[PDB]
Design a protein around this ligand. Structure first.
Ligand SMILES: COC(=O)Nc1cccc2ccc(C(=N)N)cc12
Length: 246
């Protein structure tokens, strides 16, 4: 997250921190995710496509820091790694950038809701917020495009949804951004999601309900003028989510 504010997991309790175990035992941060039901975390296929082995992943819930075992946090392994069959990546655009991770503790249990671990509601069909709506993003992603390290403390920011017609403008993304993708950015281009924030939530309050409207997917640079953050539009994927969580 470029700009914005440092936060804690109690403010973003649906946030899942996803890591990968390498040969030799080193563990590195991969992507963010969102808890949609006790056994299920939703993220982006691009985070996993190159290492599609469920055994490699570690998922934390209730974790506020990149290298601290936050009081009340829960550690999980991945029982099922479901990637979208029609996923693909162009130079910029990522297609069907959605993945499901069925989580399980070493004891075989799913998440136990608490003050720091909570689910996030899915949107309803054909009901996304109007353009101009303010939504929040959360992640352990880069604080500056030129950084190589990720921030130790969890960050959040607020961005505004951008219409498909605006995002398809020539100086924006043209025909590279599709109706299955949602654009969002800061009108002043000072704050945004960045590399490392992928798979994380774009949460919008709609009709008084906090909803998982998007999943961080892609973007040209970070907080770059006329280059919004591009998010998987969760409402389009409701039949796929329902079918793959059954
Ligand atoms: C410096 O360019 C990047 O690091 N871009 C990005 C790489 C990987 C994922 C990204 C996701 C969102 C964005 C964005 N601009 N919001 C940018 C991303």
């Amino acid at each position: 997250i470029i700009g914005g504010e440092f936060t804690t997991i109690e403010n973003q309790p649906w946030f899942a921190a996803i890591y990968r175990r390498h040969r030799g035992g080193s563990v590195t941060y991969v992507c963010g995710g969102s808890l949609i039901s006790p056994c299920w975390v939703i993220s982006a296929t691009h985070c996993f496509i190159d290492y599609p082995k469920k055994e490699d992943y570690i998922v934390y819930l209730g974790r506020s820091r990149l290298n601290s075992n936050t009081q009340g946090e829960m550690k999980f392994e991945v029982e099922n790694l479901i990637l979208h069959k029609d996923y693909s990546a162009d130079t910029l655009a990522h297609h069907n950038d959605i993945a499901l991770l069925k989580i399980r503790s070493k004891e075989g249990r799913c998440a136990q809701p608490s003050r720091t671990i909570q689910t996030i509601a899915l949107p309803s069909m054909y009901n996304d917020p109007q353009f101009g709506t303010s939504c929040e993003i959360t992640g352990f992603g880069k604080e500056q495009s030129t950084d190589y390290l990720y921030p130790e403390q969890l960050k959040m920011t607020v961005v505004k949804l951008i219409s498909h017609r605006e995002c398809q403008q020539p100086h924006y993304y043209g025909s590279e951004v599709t109706t299955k993708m949602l654009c969002a950015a800061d009108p002043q281009w000072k704050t945004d999601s960045c590399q490392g924030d992928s798979g994380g939530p774009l949460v919008c309050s709609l009709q008084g309900r906090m909803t998982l409207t998007g999943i961080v997917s892609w973007g040209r640079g970070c907080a770059l003028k006329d280059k919004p953050g591009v998010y998987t539009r969760v409402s389009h994927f409701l039949p796929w989510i329902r079918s793959h969580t059954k």
